[model samples]
Target: ENKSQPKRLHVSNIPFRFRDPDLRQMFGQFGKILDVEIIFNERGSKGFGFVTFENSADADRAREKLHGTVVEGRKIEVNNATA
Candidate 1:
C-alpha cells in the first residue's frame, strides 16, 4: 500500500454488519469526512472499511479517536490507508 495519501484511512476489525452511516458517524466525530467505503464479501462488510478525509490531520484524528474502540464486539484497527 502506498502512503502518499494519508487522508485515506484503513479501518479494520469492523463487524460484518457495520454500515456506512455508522462508520461516517464514528469517524465524523473527529473531522470532516471526504468519503467512506465499507468493503463487503458474500457475507457482507468483510470486517473492514476505508475512510477518506479532507486532510491528513482529520485522518490522524480519526486514528487517535477511533482506533481500538469496540464496535459490534470487535476492537477496530485504524491506520493510514495504502494501495
Candidate 2:
C-alpha cells in the first residue's frame, strides 16, 4: 500500500476496545477523516492506528496538538505517520 501521503497520522496506545469509528470520530473533530486504521493483535489485546485527514494543515495540527491524551483512562500517543 502507498503510505507516502502527507495527511496520514500515526496514533498509538489506543484502548484495546477501540473501534474504527472511534478513531475517525476523534480526528473528525478537527476535520474530515478520509480514512482511519486501528491496529492490534488478532484478538486486540492492544491497539494503535493511523488516520488520513482531508486537510494537510489540519492533519499536522491535529497530530501535534494530540500528542498525549487520556482515553479510557490511558494516555494515548499521536504523531506524524512515517512512510
Candidate 3:
C-alpha cells in the first residue's frame, strides 16, 4: 500500500562547504522546511543531500525554482525524492 507522506526533495551537486544551516537558508525561502541533510563520507561531503518540506506544494516549488540553479559556481539538481 502506498501511503502519502510529507514531500521530500533530492538535492545533488551541492557545494562541499555547505552545512545544515546553509541548506536550510537556501530552501527555507520556498516554504516551511522540515529538515535538510547533507550526505558525507570518509573523504568528506558527498555533495548531495535531502530536503523535506512541510507539504508537496512547497517541495514542488523548491524543485522548480532551484533545479539547475548555480551555487558556488556549481549547478545543482533538485528532484522529487522517490524514497
Candidate 4:
C-alpha cells in the first residue's frame, strides 16, 4: 500500500554520459539530496539510476518537473522507486 509520496525516485532513460555529479546537478536544487547512485554492468553505465531526497515533497516535485523531460534528446522517466 502506498503510504505517501516517495522520496526515493527511479530515474530511467538518463543520458548515457551522465554521472553521479550530473544527477546531483539535475536534482540538487529541489532539496537536500540523501543519495545519488548510477549502476553499471559489463557494458558500463546502466542508463538509469536512483535519487533520494530528504523529503517526499521534493521528490514529488522533482518527479513532476523531470519526468518525461527531453534532456539531450532523451526523454527521461522519473517515478516513485518505492511505489
Candidate 5:
C-alpha cells in the first residue's frame, strides 16, 4: 500500500441504505471512483464505508471539496486511507 503509487480514501458517515451505485453517483461528480466498499456490522447494517479513487490527485480533490458536507443528513467524513 504505497501512498505514493496511488491514493485510496475512507468515506464514513454514509447511511446504511447507501449502495454501490449511489456511492458511485455521489463521488462520481468529483472524480473516478475505483472502488466503493460498504462496511457492514455483524447484523449487515452499514456503519461506515470506504471509497478508492483512481489516483491520489482525485482523492485529494475530493477531500478538499467534499469533507464535512452533509449528505442525506449525514455529515460525510472524507479522508485518505493509510495502510
Candidate 6:
C-alpha cells in the first residue's frame, strides 16, 4: 500500500482541565483515534495537545468540525501536526 499522509493533529487553546480521556471522547466521534496526548509543563497543562487518527480523512473531518469550537469558554485551534 502507498504510504498515507500523517493523520496527526496539533491542537491548541483547549480547556486547561482537558485530559486524555476528555480528548478521546471529543475527537473519537470523528474516527478511530490512535492516540491523544496533552502537553504539560512543570506548572501544569500547556493548554495544547495532539490527536492521532488512523485515517487522514477522519483527521480532516475533525479539523473542519472541531476547529474554533468552544469548550469551557475557550475556542480551540486544530492543524496538521508538523515535525
Question: Which stretches of model 6 miss by more than 4 angstroms?
Answer: 1-6
Tell me which of candidates 1 and 6 scores higher on TM-score.
6
Higher-scoring candidate on lDDT, 2 or 6: 6
Clashing pairs in 3: none
lDDT of 5 by residue, 29-62 (tens): 8777778888787778564777887777777878
RMSD to the hidden true structure, all candidates: 3.3, 4.0, 2.6, 2.5, 2.6, 2.2
* TM-scores, all models, native as reference: 0.85, 0.82, 0.90, 0.90, 0.82, 0.91
User: In terms of TM-score, which candidate is strongest?
Assistant: 6
Error in Å for residue 47 of model 5:
2.7
TM-score between model 3 and native: 0.90
Model 4 Cα lDDT, one tens digit per residue, 1-83: 33254478999999889999999999998988989999889998989999998888888889999999999999999988854
Off by over 4 Å in 1: 1-6
Lowest lDDT sum, 10 consecutive residues, model 3, at 1-10
Ranking by lDDT: 6, 4, 3, 1, 2, 5
What is the C-alpha RMSD, rounded to one decimal, of candidate 4? 2.5
Whole-model lDDT values for every prediction: 0.83, 0.80, 0.89, 0.90, 0.78, 0.91
Put down candidate 3 lDDT per residue, 8-81, tens digits, no spaces: 89999999999899999999998898888899999999999999988887788889899999999999999987
**Two-way TM-score contest, 4 vs 5, winner:** 4
Q: On a 0 to 100 scale, what is the lDDT of residue 11 in model 1?
A: 96
**Native-structure RMSD, model 1:** 3.3
Worst 10 residues of 6 by lDDT: 1-10
What does candidate 6 score on TM? 0.91
Residue 38 lDDT in candidate 4: 93
* 75: Cα error in model 4, Å: 0.2
Q: Please write out the lDDT profile of model 1 over residues 32-60, one tens digit for every residue.
A: 88899999877656879899987777677
Residue 4 CA displacement from its true place in model 6, Å: 5.7
- Give residue 8's error in model 4 in angstroms: 0.4
